[PDB]
């Protein structure tokens, strides 16, 4: 059921007495096609072992995003330790305007009409963790109704 997209496969190197030791990581996101995402970061000595470990680590510890039909509920800024990022709700049917790793995590996240922009540095790790932060701190109007102690047509 869960669709998964790899983003990057980097080749880290740890230097030992013999020489270098080439390892491969993997940054794969997974999600249902609606507001349930989990990113995952795996790292192993060979590539498909790393991407399978990344897929397991993403297949658990997922997220719970409440959503509109295919779009967000407000503009959000999200910052995490490399990068602040800004993603914005859109009109119905206008394409996932993002790129790099934001594109993959949002089209897995099942938002389909967004406007995003990556400020600061744009490592795939940093920007997918900041996008996950943005989808976290986004909230539904029923949630804000229950929070503020009003009704949804009283908020309008």
């Amino acid at each position: 059921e869960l669709q998964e997209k790899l983003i990057a496969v980097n080749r880290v190197s740890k230097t030992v007495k013999g020489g270098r030791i080439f390892s491969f990581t993997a940054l794969t996101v997974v999600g249902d096609g609606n507001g349930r995402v989990g990113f995952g970061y795996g790292k192993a000595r060979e590539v498909p072992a790393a991407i399978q470990k990344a897929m397991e680590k993403a297949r658990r510890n997922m997220i719970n995003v409440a959503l509109n039909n295919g779009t967000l509920q407000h503009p959000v800024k999200g910052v995490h330790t490399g990068s602040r990022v800004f993603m914005q709700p859109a009109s119905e049917g206008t394409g996932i305007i993002a790129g790099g790793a934001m594109r993959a995590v949002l089209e897995v996240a099942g938002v389909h009409n967004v406007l995003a922009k990556a400020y600061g540095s744009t490592n795939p790790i940093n920007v997918v963790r900041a996008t996950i932060d943005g989808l976290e701190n986004m909230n539904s109007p029923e949630m804000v109704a229950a929070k503020r102690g009003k009704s949804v047509e009283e908020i309008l």
Partner: protein, 129 residues
């Protein structure tokens, strides 16, 4: 010194909410009474209360939901270094309708949704998100 009493009020609300206080307190004023009246109306505080005969203390009782804070973010707009007066079509809409923006219009102080339904701009004091 105390070059912005309204930002003193807003910073006290933000600090008390992010540090899990219950009943925050500040020196009172007429504009602080009006802004706290707006917040008690819309539902970002439980109740406010101004106590004191000559110089009073305004007390704000903060709301909570499942432990977390109720006001997510709150900021100035029209700081005294740079004031922001906005016409009626160029009014904001913070958080796509969810949050509120406090505007002082000619008819007292009111939320920007009421300002749009009364058809006049004013000055944007804060963006209670």
């Amino acid at each position: 010194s105390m070059q912005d009493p309204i930002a003193d009020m807003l910073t006290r609300i933000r600090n008390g909410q992010a540090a899990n206080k219950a009943a925050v307190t500040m020196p009172s004023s007429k504009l602080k009474v009006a802004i706290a009246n707006v917040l008690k109306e819309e539902g970002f505080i439980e109740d406010f209360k101004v106590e004191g005969d000559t110089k009073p203390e305004l007390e704000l009782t903060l709301k909570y939901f499942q432990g977390k804070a109720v006001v997510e973010s709150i900021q100035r707009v029209s700081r005294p270094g740079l004031r922001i007066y906005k016409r009626k079509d160029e009014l904001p809409k913070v958080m796509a309708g969810l949050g509120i923006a406090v505007v002082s219009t000619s008819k007292g102080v009111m939320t920007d949704r009421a300002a749009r339904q009364a058809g006049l701009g004013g000055e944007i004091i804060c963006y209670v998100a």
